[PDB]
Amino acid sequence: KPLEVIKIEDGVYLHTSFKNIEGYGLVDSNGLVVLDNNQAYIIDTPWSEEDTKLLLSWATDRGYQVMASISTHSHEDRTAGIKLLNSKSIPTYTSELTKKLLAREGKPVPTHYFKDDEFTLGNGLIELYYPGAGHTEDNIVAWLPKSKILFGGCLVRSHEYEGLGYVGDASISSWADSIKNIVSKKYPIQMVVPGHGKVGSSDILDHTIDLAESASN
């Protein structure tokens, strides 16, 4: 089931990738395309090279110039399209840690990376922040000042999950602290976009804190 792209705010589109996993069923994966006039920025690649191809087609069929992607942590559902973007000379970004994690796992690396706990993509359009470990040791979040959207990636859990998801790379006892660090930014959050599941409100943060503290206990 191929890639779906839908407008969720002015200049912000939710892109959703799917798999049919035999034995489980339908799973989805979210990222964003953020536009700045005709420039397009990808927050997380679709889950596969093929769906990453469809996302670029989506952009070029609309005449958008894809300027860069940013991936929120090293897992395959965040980075599967980095290699294809690299072959198209489209700058790809992760944090330094995510990049070095990919490199260690023998995966394609972004051509660019950022060193501090905060960075910007699109010259202020996208604010990135590392709040601490949770879902992974390297997970970062993206704040969109204009649309008032926090892309939480997998550090956040949508309202239809009651588990933290895959925790083999997780720091469960760190996670709730890391969400509080996001809370401390006092972002005027209108919408939180999780890496999987439905978009919700700032409520998603509290729901994630509950999940983490309960798992940590």
On whether the CB atoms of residues 61 and 33 are closer than 8 A, the answer is no
Side chain identity, residue 73: H
- Selection from Zn ion, Ca ion, its own copies, none that 69 binds (CB < 5 to 8 A by kind) is Ca ion
Q: Smallest distance from the beta carbon of 42 to Ca ion, in angstroms?
A: 7
Residue 159's Cβ-count burial label (10 Å; 0-12, 13-18, 19+) is: middle
Alpha carbon distance 23, 9 (integer Å): 35
Task: Identify which of 136, 52, 128 has the alpha carbon closest to the alpha carbon of residue 102.
Answer: 136
Asked if 155 touches Zn ion (CB under 5 A), the answer is: no
- Selection from its own copies, Ca ion, Zn ion, none that 25 binds (CB < 5 to 8 A by kind) is its own copies
Q: Using CB under 5 A, which of the segments 30-38, 107-115, 127-135, 180-188 binds Ca ion?
A: 107-115
Residue 207 marked ligand-binding: no
Phi, psi dihedrals of residue 172, rounded to the nearest 5°: -60, -40
Alpha carbon distance 169, 193 (integer Å): 21
Q: Using CB under 5 A, which of the segments 52-60, 85-93, 149-157, 183-191 binds Ca ion?
A: 85-93
Q: Give the orientation angle of helix 203-216 with respect to helix 172-183, to 10 degrees.
A: 160
Q: Using CB under 5 A, which of the segments 54-62, 65-73, 111-119, 168-176 binds Ca ion?
A: 65-73
CA distances from 96 to 57, 59, 66, 110 (A): 29, 27, 22, 10
Q: Out of 29, 30, 52, 71, name the contact with Ca ion by CB under 5 A.
A: 71
CB-nearer residue toward its own copies: 113 or 161 = 161
CB-nearer residue toward Ca ion: 113 or 161 = 113
Alpha carbon distance 68, 70 (integer Å): 7
CB-nearer residue toward Ca ion: 112 or 185 = 112
Q: Smallest distance from the beta carbon of 154 to Zn ion, in angstroms?
A: 4
Residues flagged as binding site for Ca(2+)? 69
Interface residues with Ca ion (CB under 5 A)? Answer: 69, 71, 92, 110
Binding residues, by number, are: 15, 17, 22, 69, 73, 75, 77, 95, 135, 138, 154, 196
